[PDB]
Design a protein around this nucleic acid. Structure first.
Ligand SMILES: [Mg+2]
Ligand SMILES: [Mg+2]
Ligand SMILES: [Mg+2]
Ligand SMILES: [Mg+2]
Ligand SMILES: [Mg+2]
Ligand SMILES: [Mg+2]
Ligand SMILES: [Mg+2]
Ligand SMILES: [Mg+2]
Ligand SMILES: [Mg+2]
Ligand SMILES: [Mg+2]
Ligand SMILES: [Mg+2]
Ligand SMILES: [Mg+2]
Ligand SMILES: [Mg+2]
Ligand SMILES: [Mg+2]
Ligand SMILES: [Mg+2]
Ligand SMILES: [Mg+2]
Ligand SMILES: [Mg+2]
Ligand SMILES: [Mg+2]
Ligand SMILES: [Mg+2]
Ligand SMILES: [Mg+2]
Ligand SMILES: [Mg+2]
Ligand SMILES: [Mg+2]
Ligand SMILES: [Mg+2]
Ligand SMILES: [Mg+2]
Ligand SMILES: [Mg+2]
Ligand SMILES: [Mg+2]
Ligand SMILES: [Mg+2]
Ligand SMILES: [Mg+2]
Ligand SMILES: [Mg+2]
Ligand SMILES: [Mg+2]
Ligand SMILES: [Mg+2]
Ligand SMILES: [Mg+2]
Ligand SMILES: [Mg+2]
Ligand SMILES: [Mg+2]
Ligand SMILES: [Mg+2]
Ligand SMILES: [Mg+2]
Ligand SMILES: [Mg+2]
Ligand SMILES: [Mg+2]
Ligand SMILES: [Mg+2]
Ligand SMILES: [Mg+2]
Ligand SMILES: [Mg+2]
Ligand SMILES: [Mg+2]
Ligand SMILES: [Mg+2]
Ligand SMILES: [Mg+2]
Ligand SMILES: [Mg+2]
Ligand SMILES: [Mg+2]
Ligand SMILES: [Mg+2]
Ligand SMILES: [Mg+2]
Ligand SMILES: [Mg+2]
Ligand SMILES: [Mg+2]
Ligand SMILES: [Mg+2]
Ligand SMILES: [Mg+2]
Ligand SMILES: [Mg+2]
Ligand SMILES: [Mg+2]
Ligand SMILES: [Mg+2]
Ligand SMILES: [Mg+2]
Ligand SMILES: [Mg+2]
Ligand SMILES: [Mg+2]
Ligand SMILES: [Mg+2]
Ligand SMILES: [Mg+2]
Ligand SMILES: [Mg+2]
Ligand SMILES: [Mg+2]
Ligand SMILES: [Mg+2]
Lengths: 117, 138, 113, 151, 59, 101
RNA sequence: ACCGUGAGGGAAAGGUGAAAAGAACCCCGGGAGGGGAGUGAAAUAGAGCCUGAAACCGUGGGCUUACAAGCAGUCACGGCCCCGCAAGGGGUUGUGGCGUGCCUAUUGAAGCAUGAGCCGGCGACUCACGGUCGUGGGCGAGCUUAAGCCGUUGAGGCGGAG
RNA sequence: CAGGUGGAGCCUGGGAGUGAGGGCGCGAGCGAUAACGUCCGCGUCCGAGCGCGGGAACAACCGAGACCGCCAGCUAAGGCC
RNA sequence: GGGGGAUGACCCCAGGCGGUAGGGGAGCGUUCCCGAUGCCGAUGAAGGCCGACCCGCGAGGGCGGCUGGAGGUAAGGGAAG
């Protein structure tokens, strides 16, 4: 018996071009450039996942350091205060705390300013 | 819990004297303000910044021999179209522009960096346009 | 209620004819008729014929009232290409495609309350 | 394949790719690579494996109570109407496929046309046929030669 | 001379932007001084062209 | 009157009547988990230490789950190396009831 | 057919419908074509006729774009449009972060090194007989038949030369 | 002789691929106490880690061996106008 | 790998899991055969076009809608153009 390609290759191609929807020019319309583009989207996604984690923290940090410079200090010291002060409850995620709950932040500043000296 | 992000904010203004302030050291902050990395809601992709007005910019002062030795260069497009302009010459011809330059180079690059630079309004000597609030900052 | 005509296998190149079609899209039949006469292109002739057969089609078949109809949609699609051998220097022999238009005029009635 | 052996084009300087005859498999219309030729799928099973296998497959029908021996029928004089009668009387309604093994030409041609019967001379007892059919039925003539085959 | 050749097939984007000037202008027409029909100006009409001089007679 | 609570190596600001998705934990649905772990009161001056003791927040497991599939792919040019794996990350949902001082 | 002086080379090209019932007649038109009408279960089965993919061309709609610059994606936020009681999702892209095509060949390629205009379909580790290991079973001081003979709804048996 | 249970070691067999290497450190020869030079030695990395961080960018220098996910934490190198 | 003594597909606990040449292992899918004088099918086969839905790590499999108009062919096994 002979098994000719038939339906298989059209399917496999369709799958991928579907994934490529929205991509520019041929990259959406040609199975090859679709596939090539996708390799690239695949590794960026993975890589950018790990880095979304970085991208966010570095935002939180600027935001803290911003808010507590109103209260006259470094992010640098602030964290150290909070380290000594036992307040290792983090944050840096919360940081809406600095924005949405200013006083609760301020209290947190003062618990921080007074630690180990 | 998503991270908070500003809704449309009020464009606060700010006034600066610059007379006797150094240059890049004055520039550093003018940048920070422009970005608004002093505001706790700071967002990278938006630019809720302060507008900055700077006066007495003929009067920035700088250290070392820079007034003579420091050169600004301008390449036109053309053969031998690189222009070389000393600090003293600049200040004497267009005072400021040196602060505008120092700040611009300190703002980020791309569509948004170029916008923030519009928000820094620099004048020579005293006064300026009196429209907004412009709390004096030192 | 809309009325349409389609010329099929018109031996003309779609790009060429499409050009004068865009010249009458959305136009009232009175100007559309007027434009094709004094538009100087070979595709003016053919489009006019389709346009007209679609006007005739409106009045007789669809009871649409000749004074109120404009061009609603009009478009040329591209039918099959006539391929001819064009002999070339150093014995080379390319092939030119004598291409083919499918012309479409669709008519509808200007609201005309 | 039909075509010539001629080299289709010079092989340098035409600017085209590079070729031999058009019978080459890379060509639409050319030879096939490694596809099928006539060949003989038969092999030789060990004979003891066929004995064992024959024996076991009967055994497996016996172990199920599905095996029946019969004497003499009387649904002979081959007519499927006649058989279909005796069948009923013997407890075969054709709710289960039946492998009928007997040397009687007449009973065989009787059952033959039933959709639920397959039919065999005894010297032709094979395991495939046993396993396909839900119930085995033999006459005693058949069971003899079946027993004389194994061992 | 050697043989300049295009280095890259041009994108549908690019040819279609080439053609951004290709669109036609409708012919400029004015109503006929006598007759009902439309005529491009400064031209004797296809029906009964003018007055003082002798038009091509559709009359 | 919020809290700041610690479940599954992360922290979240919860309020009463908050439906919160959280890393999966061992519970049957409908059961109640007091996560004895609480890091802040929304009252300001009560804050501190790793965890304020005696405090806790009560939310009950609304049922578990699996998140929308993430396709994590790896490609290495010129070495003929490609890997595809789908990943669905199991969670549990909670509704936040009582903030207990 | 065609190509070659000749020997010789040597293709493409199948499918309406159950039935032609193969669209009378009217309309536009020089015809071609189409609109009605009619046939049909169906006419985007209408003869350039089963299905009718993809590249390709086009009309309409939504989002978007004329001070930004780039392997075209990706992660985040925001806007506008759609679906949904809701929460939620689909679309699109403004700004921000990140980002050196695929394959091949190489010590080393985004590479200014090879190949590829794009899409469809064709395309490359086989089979015979020996061998050598492993493995699943049969029988074990034994194991096993070849040709051939008999016999067969695709029935198996015998045959001991070797 | 002892510790060392390791994707350790030894024996028999089946299947390979490789036999163009490169940089860097150290030790020599050749070279000019030239070469991104050449040839050996011992080591390492690239090769196959052109995956991540640092070094502006950069196979092989510093950091470090990427199973998947997280809008959590601590660090390495290098950094903190 | 160790336990749990269900003899696994199942639950604990501890580890390992960058990779080219290459070795090993398990799966998916296409054509054909037995299963089939069967079963699915015009209340619609195969094929086509959508899908933000379900199952699978993945190759894939489902399901729903549209098109299509006469075929398709489980479980379990066999063979390959
Ligand atoms: Mg094939
Ligand atoms: Mg990290
Ligand atoms: Mg801390
Ligand atoms: Mg010529
Ligand atoms: Mg000639
Ligand atoms: Mg020859
Ligand atoms: Mg060429
Ligand atoms: Mg052939
Ligand atoms: Mg010349
Ligand atoms: Mg020239
Ligand atoms: Mg790369
Ligand atoms: Mg390589
Ligand atoms: Mg001849
Ligand atoms: Mg009818
Ligand atoms: Mg019709
Ligand atoms: Mg159809
Ligand atoms: Mg049809
Ligand atoms: Mg048919
Ligand atoms: Mg058709
Ligand atoms: Mg459009
Ligand atoms: Mg500009
Ligand atoms: Mg703009
Ligand atoms: Mg450009
Ligand atoms: Mg971007
Ligand atoms: Mg390949
Ligand atoms: Mg080479
Ligand atoms: Mg080479
Ligand atoms: Mg080389
Ligand atoms: Mg290039
Ligand atoms: Mg070259
Ligand atoms: Mg190239
Ligand atoms: Mg070469
Ligand atoms: Mg190649
Ligand atoms: Mg192809
Ligand atoms: Mg063999
Ligand atoms: Mg063998
Ligand atoms: Mg063997
Ligand atoms: Mg015979
Ligand atoms: Mg020892
Ligand atoms: Mg080893
Ligand atoms: Mg070995
Ligand atoms: Mg060698
Ligand atoms: Mg080496
Ligand atoms: Mg060497
Ligand atoms: Mg040293
Ligand atoms: Mg060297
Ligand atoms: Mg050297
Ligand atoms: Mg070395
Ligand atoms: Mg190599
Ligand atoms: Mg590296
Ligand atoms: Mg290594
Ligand atoms: Mg590189
Ligand atoms: Mg770097
Ligand atoms: Mg590892
Ligand atoms: Mg350090
Ligand atoms: Mg593990
Ligand atoms: Mg591995
Ligand atoms: Mg077939
Ligand atoms: Mg019917
Ligand atoms: Mg089939
Ligand atoms: Mg279907
Ligand atoms: Mg089947
Ligand atoms: Mg093949």
């Amino acid at each position: 018996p002979r098994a000719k390609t038939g339906v298989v290759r059209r399917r496999k191609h369709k799958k991928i071009l579907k994934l490529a929807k929205g991509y520019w020019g041929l990259r959406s319309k040609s199975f090859r450039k679709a596939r090539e583009t996708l390799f690239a989207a695949g590794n960026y996604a993975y890589a950018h996942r790990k880095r979304r984690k970085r991208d966010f923290r570095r935002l939180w940090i600027v935001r803290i350091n911003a808010a507590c410079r109103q209260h006259g200090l470094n992010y640098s010291t602030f964290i150290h205060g909070l380290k000594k002060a036992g307040i290792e409850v983090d944050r840096k995620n919360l940081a809406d705390l600095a924005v949405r709950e200013p006083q609760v932040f301020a209290e947190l500043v003062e618990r921080a300013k007074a630690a180990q000296g | 819990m998503k991270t908070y992000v500003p809704k449309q904010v009020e464009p606060r203004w700010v006034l600066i004297d610059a007379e006797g302030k150094t240059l890049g050291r004055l520039a550093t902050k003018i940048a920070t303000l422009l970005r608004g990395k002093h505001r706790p809601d700071w967002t990278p992709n938006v630019a809720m910044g302060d507008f900055v007005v700077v006066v007495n910019a003929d009067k920035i002062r700088v250290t070392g021999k820079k007034l003579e030795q420091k050169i600004y260069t301008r390449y036109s497009g053309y053969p031998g179209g690189l222009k070389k302009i000393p600090l003293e010459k600049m200040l004497a011809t267009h005072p400021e522009r040196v602060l505008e330059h120092a700040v611009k180079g300190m703002l980020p690059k791309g569509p948004l960096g170029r916008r923030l630079f519009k928000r820094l309004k620099v004048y020579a000597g005293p006064d300026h346009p009196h429209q907004a609030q412009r709390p004096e900052k030192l | 209620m809309e009325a349409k005509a389609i010329a099929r296998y018109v031996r003309i190149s779609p790009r060429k004819v499409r050009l004068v079609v865009d010249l009458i899209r959305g136009k009232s039949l009175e100007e559309a008729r007027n434009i094709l006469r004094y538009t100087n292109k070979r595709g003016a002739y053919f489009v006019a014929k389709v346009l007209e057969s679609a006007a005739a089609n409106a009045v007789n078949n669809h009871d649409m009232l000749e004074d109120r109809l404009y061009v609603k949609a009009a478009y040329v699609d591209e039918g099959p290409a006539l391929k001819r051998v064009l002999p070339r220097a150093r014995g080379r022999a390319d092939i030119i495609k004598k291409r083919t238009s499918h012309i479409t005029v669709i008519l509808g009635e200007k609201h005309g309350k | 394949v039909a075509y010539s052996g001629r080299k289709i084009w010079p092989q340098k300087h035409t600017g085209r790719a590079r070729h031999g005859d058009i019978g080459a498999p890379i060509f639409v219309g050319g030879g096939v690579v490694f596809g099928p030729k006539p060949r003989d799928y038969s092999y030789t099973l060990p004979k003891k494996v066929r004995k064992k296998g024959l024996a076991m497959a009967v055994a497996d029908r016996a172990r199920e109570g599905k095996l029946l021996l019969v004497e003499a029928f009387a649904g002979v004089n081959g007519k499927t109407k006649e058989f279909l009668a005796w069948a009923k009387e013997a407890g075969l309604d054709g709710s289960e496929s039946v492998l009928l093994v007997t040397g009687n030409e007449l009973v065989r041609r009787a059952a033959r046309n039933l959709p639920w019967v397959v039919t065999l001379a005894p010297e032709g007892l094979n395991v495939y046929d046993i396993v396909r059919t839900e119930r085995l039925v033999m006459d005693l003539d058949a069971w003899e030669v079946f027993q004389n085959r194994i061992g | 001379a050697k043989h300049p050749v295009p280095k890259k097939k041009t994108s549908k984007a690019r040819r279609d932007a080439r053609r951004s000037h290709h669109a036609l202008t409708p012919p400029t027409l004015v109503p006929c001084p006598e007759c009902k029909a439309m005529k491009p100006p400064h031209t004797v009409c296809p029906e009964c062209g003018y007055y003082a001089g002798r038009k091509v007679l559709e009359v | 009157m919020f809290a700041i609570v610690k479940t599954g190596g992360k922290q979240y600001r919860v309020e009463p009547g908050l439906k919160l998705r959280v890393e999966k934990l061992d519970a049957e649905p409908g059961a109640t988990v007091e996560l004895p772990v609480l890091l802040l009161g929304g009252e300001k001056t009560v804050v501190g230490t790793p965890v304020v003791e005696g405090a806790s927040v009560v939310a009950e497991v609304l049922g578990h789950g699996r998140g929308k599939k993430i396709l994590v792919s790896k490609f290495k040019a010129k070495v003929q190396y490609r890997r595809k794996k789908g990943h669905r990350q199991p969670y549990t949902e909670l509704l936040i009831k009582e903030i207990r001082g």
